[PDB]
């Protein structure tokens, strides 16, 4: 509360460390469904159904331009990428499996880097 604070967690490396995680996600062999925004002209149903599209290139640009206020807003966008994927793709599809794999990969890096 006013004039009553928990001890200050060092957040000075968060930007660099989220960048490193995102590099590792970009270079995973199962990243291909997620590298670029879904083409809303060429994929029927995507625009109407997926209210907040997100992809790694869009996260990279937001990260690079100071549009994440803290590491939690960064994790929310990464998870959005996988939540969108589950919304639109059957579990038993190459893209559906890709999304589950990448989510797992991300959540482990996230825990190991920050928890």
Swiss-Prot record:
State its location(s): Nucleus
**Positions of the Bromo domain:** 9-113
| Source taxon at top rank | Eukaryota
Q: Which tissues express it? A: Expressed at varying levels in several tissues, whereas a smaller transcript was expressed specifically in testis.
What does the function comment of this entry state? Regulatory subunit of the ATP-dependent BRF-1 and BRF-5 ISWI chromatin remodeling complexes, which form ordered nucleosome arrays on chromatin and facilitate access to DNA during DNA-templated processes such as DNA replication, transcription, and repair. Both complexes regulate the spacing of nucleosomes along the chromatin and have the ability to slide mononucleosomes to the center of a DNA template. The BRF-1 ISWI chromatin remodeling complex has a lower ATP hydrolysis rate than the BRF-5 ISWI chromatin remodeling complex.
Protein family per UniProt: Belongs to the WAL family.
Q: How does it assemble?
A: Component of the BRF-1 ISWI chromatin remodeling complex, at least composed of SMARCA1 and BAZ2B, which regulates the spacing of histone octamers on the DNA template to facilitate access to DNA. Within the BRF-1 ISWI chromatin remodeling complex interacts with SMARCA1; the interaction is direct. Component of the BRF-5 ISWI chromatin remodeling complex, at least composed of SMARCA5/SNF2H and BAZ2B, which regulates the spacing of histone octamers on the DNA template to facilitate access to DNA.
**Under which name does UniProt file this protein?**
Bromodomain adjacent to zinc finger domain protein 2B
What organism, scientifically named, is this protein from? Homo sapiens (Human)
Lineage of source species = Eukaryota, Metazoa, Chordata, Craniata, Vertebrata
Please state the gene responsible for encoding this protein.
BAZ2B
Full protein segment contained here: 2054 to 2166 of 2168
